[PDB]
Amino acid sequence: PQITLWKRPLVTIKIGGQLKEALLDTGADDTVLEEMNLPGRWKPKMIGGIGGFIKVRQYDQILIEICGHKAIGTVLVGPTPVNIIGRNLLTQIGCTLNF
Amino acid sequence: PQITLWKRPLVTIKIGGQLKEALLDTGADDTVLEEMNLPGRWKPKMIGGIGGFIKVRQYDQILIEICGHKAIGTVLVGPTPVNIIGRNLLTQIGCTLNF
Numbered sequence: 001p002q003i004t005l006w007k008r009p010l011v012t013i014k015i016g017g018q019l020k021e022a023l024l025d026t027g028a029d030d031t032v033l034e035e036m037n038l039p040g041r042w043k044p045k046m047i048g049g050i051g052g053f054i055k056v057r058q059y060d061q062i063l064i065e066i067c068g069h070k071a072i073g074t075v076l077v078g079p080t081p082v083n084i085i086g087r088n089l090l091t092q093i094g095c096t097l098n099f
Numbered sequence: 100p101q102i103t104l105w106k107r108p109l110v111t112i113k114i115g116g117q118l119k120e121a122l123l124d125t126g127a128d129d130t131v132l133e134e135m136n137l138p139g140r141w142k143p144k145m146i147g148g149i150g151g152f153i154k155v156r157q158y159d160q161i162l163i164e165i166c167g168h169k170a171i172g173t174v175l176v177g178p179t180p181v182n183i184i185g186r187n188l189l190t191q192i193g194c195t196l197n198f
C-alpha cells in the first residue's frame with residue numbers, strides 16, 4: 001500500500017497475540033511500544049527522544065505482523081507516548097519513502 | 100527520490116538562507132529544528148515526545164527547500180536533538196510511505 005502523510009500513518013499490528021495500532025515512524029531507529037506484557041527475558045535499557053530519556057525493557061527476536069507483513073526484531077517496551085514502528089522493522093517489510 | 104530505511108533518512112534543507120541536515124520523520128506531526136535565528140513573529144509553545152517536553156518558538160509561514168522541493172508551513176525552533184521534518188511539510192513535497 002501507498003500511504004499519504006496528510007494523517008498519521010497508523011497501522012494495525014499483532015504482537016504477543018495482541019492487536020494494537022502503531023505509528024510507522026521513519027524518524028525512529030528502534031521500535032518502542034507502550035506498556036504491554038510480552039513473553040521472554042528482557043534487558044534494561046535507556047532510550048532518548050525530544051523530551052529526554054525513558055527506561056524501557058528490551059525484547060529481542062520478537063515477531064510482529066505489521067499490516068499483514070511479518071517481521072522479527074528487537075522491540076522496546078516502556079513509557080512511550082505512542083507505539084512506534086522503527087526502521088529496524090520497517091526495512092524488514094520493505095518500507096520506502098517516495099517523493 | 101526513493102529512500103531506503105537502512106540509514107537515517109537525512110536530507111539537506113535550505114531555510115532562512117541557511118543549509119542544514121534534517122530527518123524526514125513520518126512520526127512527527129510538525130517540523131522541529133535546532134536553535135537558529137529565524138525572521139518574523141513567533142509565539143511560545145510547548146511540545147512533547149519520548150522523554151518529556153521542550154519549549155519551542157512557533158513560527159508560521161516559513162519557506163523551506165527540502166531536497167530541492169519548496170514548502171511553506173509552521174516551523175518549531177527549540178532544543179531538539181535533531182532537525183526533524185514533520186508531516187506538516189512532508190505532505191507539501193508529496194512524500195508517501197511505500198511497502
Ligand SMILES: CC(C)CN(C[C@@H](O)[C@H](Cc1cc(F)cc(F)c1)NC(=O)O[C@H]1CO[C@H]2OCC[C@H]21)S(=O)(=O)c1ccc2c(c1)CC[C@@H]2O
Pocket residue numbers: 025026027028029030031032047048049050051081082084086124125126127128129130131146147148149179180181183185
Ligand atoms: C515519539 C513520536 C510520537 C513523536 N516524535 C517523532 C519521532 O520520529 C522521533 C524523532 C526523533 C526525536 C529525537 F529527539 C531524536 C531523534 F533521533 C529522532 N523518534 C524518536 O524519538 O525515536 C526514538 C526511538 O528510536 C530512537 O531512534 C531515534 C530516537 C529514538 S518526536 O520527535 O517526539 C516529535 C516530533 C515533532 C513533534 C512532536 C514530537 C510534538 C509536536 C511536533 O509535531
